[PDB]
Amino acid sequence: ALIDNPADILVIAAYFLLVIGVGLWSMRSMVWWPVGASLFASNIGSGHFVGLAGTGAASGLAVAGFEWNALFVVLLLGWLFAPVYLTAGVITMPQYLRKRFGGRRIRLYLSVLSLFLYIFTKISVDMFSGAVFIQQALGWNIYASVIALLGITMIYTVTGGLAALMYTDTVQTFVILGGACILMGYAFHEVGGYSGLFDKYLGAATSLTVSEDPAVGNISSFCYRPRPDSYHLLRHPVTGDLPWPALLLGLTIVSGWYWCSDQVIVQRCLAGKSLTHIKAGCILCGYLKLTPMFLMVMPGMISRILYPDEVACVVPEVCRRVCGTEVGCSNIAYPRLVVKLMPNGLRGLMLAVMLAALMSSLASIFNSSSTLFTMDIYTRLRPRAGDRELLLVGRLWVVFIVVVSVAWLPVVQAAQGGQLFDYIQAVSSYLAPPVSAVFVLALFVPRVNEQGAFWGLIGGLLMGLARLIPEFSFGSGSCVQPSACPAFLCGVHYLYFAIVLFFCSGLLTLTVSLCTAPIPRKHLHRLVFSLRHSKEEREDLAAARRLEDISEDPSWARVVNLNALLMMAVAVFLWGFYA
């Protein structure tokens, strides 16, 4: 409906032709900048656009801390976790845990858990975001949009558009950043510039605030007005929607799982030619992670300014007519800005950019999940599996998880307040912190053994489920309709719960490990951070040596370290600037 003009159809078709042509033409080596671009492209998908813009429209600046916190955890990956992964000679994170602790249950459990996390927070989220973009562009329902997105994804995979070339994610990162820059320029032009956004945001509210539902009736000002601390990154510890202690500590835990314990990102970073290239790509990715504040969040705030009756709908029936979700319609923030603000031709370009972000993230996720199932689940049951059956099983597993994610999609649309990023980060905060705790204790506390690790993972799963299940079962509330969560189980912010779950999992891990037999030191050479440069042979629980070498020349190591310090100082300045 909105891309029905010849210019939009032409630009979309040109992008599809280029993608199909490059995919059909396809018929440890990466240097630092491909590594950084790959990390950024794998991380940033259409879910990031939808969620960051929606939370910026709904709440303001603080959501940028979800991307700005990633600089420090990417430096953790480059300087603490990547060395250990490279010296351990691992291809999957469950494989590292298998080397570190032994046994076969931690690897299997972590594979299954990671696949569930990909279905929940990664695949279904991206499918939902693409469907929302198709809804705004074509005026379709959510299910026609999902079917269309599945069809185009099937075309992408059949034509081979998800194949990984040497500089594919570099081009994807360039296209994402260029499209986001064009839309950011148009959006800032609409509001009268950078200062126009901050002039206008706090006054932008919908004029439709009375509901015909007698239970709702007059909706309070607190529910439709922009938050008073909308321009502040650091918000109140108990009343803030993103309290600063939770945004700085629990978000560090969740981001640490995301960047240092997760196959999607680590599989990209482990392709670096050297450790200096991995560290420099970490610096580049961290610098690129400062961009979603101005390319996603502030455009979402501008979207609230421009379309307050749609993006900031408060009345449940008005919201149901706007986006189909009665609890809020902020997810259409970036979609609407693409279709209502971009002119003919550039609107199709922005749709192509969103599809490119979606497809780069999906390529990373599909590769990682197929690898996980193939090497950590399937090959355990079929050790004699040939390459052909492994490849076929991987493709079929990818198809299976895509179907399962589409099945899960109703939960994703039932995000709390109708905010996708809240759903992503809450599920991450309920399921990830046990993995963060176990990976940290594995890397840095050699006394932790297989018993402590596995039972910390299981106990963390139990304690995080005692939060996840009531959160979903009680339904999706909003400010207008708050839902019947007991408010001791859901009143606490999910990043505070990430802190609590991380510390409870670490405590259970340490306590079970200290009550059982320790792992002898000879089994932990080059597996713990304490023994990266250990040259002894280890009892596992030429070319390979060059694969497992993390010795870097002092000059470029010093240059990379100084650039990491400079990037941290720039990030700290930005944190203070918007504090």
């Binding site: 700290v572 300045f573 600037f577 504090a579």
Partner: peptide
């Protein structure tokens, strides 16, 4: 109050002080 650039510079000063502290810890007793 403080301008946002003044707050940023205060944050950078705190970061550099912490960097010096971490370097001293690294140099003296690992």
């Amino acid at each position: 109050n403080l301008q946002p650039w003044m707050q940023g510079l205060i944050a950078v000063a705190v970061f550099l002080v912490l960097v010096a502290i971490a370097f001293a810890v690294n140099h003296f007793w690992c």
